[PDB]
Amino acid sequence: LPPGWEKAMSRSSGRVYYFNHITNASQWERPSEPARVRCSHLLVKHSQSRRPSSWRQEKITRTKEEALELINGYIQKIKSGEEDFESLASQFSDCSSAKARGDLGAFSRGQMQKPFEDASFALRTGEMSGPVFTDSGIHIILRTE
Ligand SMILES: Cc1cc(C(=O)NN)no1
Ligand SMILES: [Cl-]
């Protein structure tokens, strides 16, 4: 399988699924390096973030566990089609890039924080990560180019 992917078994159904230990994506379907990639993201900050402040909230006080629960619920709405990634990022990302529907532009290895860089370069064009942890908080990442 492509870099990072492995097999596992569902606890509740008994059916095989696929999981990526670099991007934290998981799916039923069997999964299908460049100098630069282009990505968007949605950030949820918490009280242990490097800078616990954002354009949404002068003082960010939620716990790391509470932030992960918010990220999990946004992923559910994106996967069911109830909401679009771009819409949720504009309304709820704790990054100034919410301004641009989460778009960060193109970048190379050596510029972003290392777990974000590794996840971005393990995604295929069109693919979305699961929760990704950095010193800034917890992210959902979409590779666009
Ligand atoms: C939700 C999902 C992922 C995929 C896939 O990776 N196909 N190669 N298809 O549907
Ligand atoms: Cl690709």
**CATH topology (fold) name of the largest domain:** Chitinase A, domain 3
Radius of gyration: 15 Å
Q: Calculate the terminal CA-CA distance, rounded to whole Å.
A: 22 Å
The best one-word shape is globular
Provide the structure class. Answer: alpha+beta
Biggest sheet, in brief?
4 strands, antiparallel
Q: List ligands, each type once.
A: 5-methyl-1,2-oxazole-3-carbohydrazide, chloride ion
Share in helix:
10-25%
- Strand content is 25-35%
Widest β-sheet, arrangement of strands: 5-4-7-6
Helical segment tally?
3
CATH arch. level architecture of the largest domain: Roll
Domain PpiC: 34-145
GO biological process, one term: regulation of protein localization to nucleus
Subcellular location: Nucleus; Nucleus speckle; Cytoplasm
EC number: 5.2.1.8
Describe the structure.
The protein has 145 residues and is an alpha+beta fold. The protein has two domains: 31 residues, Ubiquitin Ligase Nedd4, Chain: W (Single Sheet); 110 residues, Chitinase A, domain 3, CATH 3.10.50.40. The protein is 23% helix and 26% strand. The longest helix has 17 residues. The two termini are 22 Å apart.
Summarize the topology.
Elements: E1 5-9, E2 16-20, E3 26-27, E4 36-44, H1 64-80, H2 85-92, E5 103-108, H3 114-122, E6 132-134, E7 137-143
Antiparallel strand pairs: 1-2, 2-3, 4-5, 4-7, 6-7
This protein binds 5-methyl-1,2-oxazole-3-carbohydrazide and chloride ion.
PDB class: isomerase
Keywords: cis-trans isomerase, isomerase
Assembly: monomeric
